[PDB]
Amino acid sequence: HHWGYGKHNGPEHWHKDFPIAKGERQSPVDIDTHTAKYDPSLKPLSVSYDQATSLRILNNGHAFNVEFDDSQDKAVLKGGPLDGTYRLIQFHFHWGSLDGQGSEHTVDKKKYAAELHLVHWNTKYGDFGKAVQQPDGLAVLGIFLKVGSAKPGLQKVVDVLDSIKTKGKSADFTNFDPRGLLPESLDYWTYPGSLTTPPLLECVTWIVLKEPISVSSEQVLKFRKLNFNGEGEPEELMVDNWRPAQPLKNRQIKASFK
Numbered sequence: 001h002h003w004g005y006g007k008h009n010g011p012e013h014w015h016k017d018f019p020i021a022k023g024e025r026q027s028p029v030d031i032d033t034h035t036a037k038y039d040p041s042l043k044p045l046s047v048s049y050d051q052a053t054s055l056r057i058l059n060n061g062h063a064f065n066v067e068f069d070d071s072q073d074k075a076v077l078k079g080g081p082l083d084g085t086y087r088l089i090q091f092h093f094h095w096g097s098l099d100g101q102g103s104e105h106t107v108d109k110k111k112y113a114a115e116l117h118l119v120h121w122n123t124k125y126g127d128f129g130k131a132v133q134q135p136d137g138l139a140v141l142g143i144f145l146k147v148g149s150a151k152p153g154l155q156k157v158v159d160v161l162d163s164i165k166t167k168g169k170s171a172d173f174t175n176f177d178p179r180g181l182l183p184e185s186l187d188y189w190t191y192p193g194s195l196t197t198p199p200l201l202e203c204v205t206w207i208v209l210k211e212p213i214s215v216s217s218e219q220v221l222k223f224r225k226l227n228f229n230g231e232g233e234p235e236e237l238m239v240d241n242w243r244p245a246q247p248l249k250n251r252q253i254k255a256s257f258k
């Protein structure tokens with residue numbers, strides 16, 4: 001009886017094993033576009049992914065994770081609200097059963113079909129496991145997906161999903177360029193929050209891009225053919241792996257743009 005997204009183990013249950021679920025800086029949140037304040041002191045965001053080294057893709061039973069070599073400064077996030085250098089370690093998505101839900105953040109209560117999280121850790125803490133113990137340990141770049149035109153830079157991900165259908169399966173995933181998943185604009189909202197899965201640690205600087213990327217219906221359909229279960233277990237489609245919006249409490253969402 002471990003955590004997940006079902007009726008019996010989903011987000012309303014997590015607080016029993018992870019009491020920080022009801023904490024002061026939980027994620028995701030609703031982004032109220034009329035309450036977020038433009039902050040002219042926010043520096044521009046620096047996404048430096050030209051030397052990114054992807055290694056592997058893994059079905060972890062919750063989502064699929066594309067992992068990078070983070071043993072040197074090869075793909076880094078800097079600037080915006082961040083002090084110092086954050087190294088890309090992995091990305092993953094959250095998505096829905098239907099096009100009208102799937103994102104974790106919402107924008108004026110609007111739910112997108114999916115959300116991409118590009119996870120980075122603060123290199124002043126030396127490794128990812130130390131960085132998650134610090135209030136400024138992580139920076140997650142959140143990008144919304146809407147269903148429309150295909151995203152060409154997503155298709156290499158979609159085409160490998162058949163090879164990692166079940167929990168615990170991995171596949172070699174070299175030479176993938178995460179620059180193909182970005183929208184044109186790097187305009188963003190930022191706030192202090194948490195991991196959106198157990199252990200729900202309050203270690204994240206959230207940077208959520210305003211502009212969604214477009215993916216095709218056929219692209220998201222292939223996400224929804226994944227399984228939460230292991231090989232040889234009863235099939236449970238990997239859908240609706242999103243945590244809903246948490247109370248904003250004593251926090252301010254800042255906008256990089258007027």
Ligand SMILES: COc1ccc(N(C(=O)C#C[Si](C)(C)C)[C@H](C(=O)NCc2ccccc2)c2ccc(S(N)(=O)=O)cc2)cc1Cl
Pocket residue numbers: 060062063064065067089090092117119128129132140194195196197198199
């Ligand atoms: C979609 O589901 C995901 C996605 C990511 C991960 N994470 C890791 O597996 C890691 C690592 Si690694 C050294 C085995 C490559 C991150 C994670 O679990 N962080 C906690 C932790 C604590 C100590 C040591 C290691 C990890 C984590 C990171 C970001 C988020 S999110 N959704 O962006 O807020 C959540 C969890 C977990 C799940 Cl269940």
Ligand SMILES: [Zn+2]
Pocket residue numbers: 092093094117196
């Ligand atoms: Zn996530």
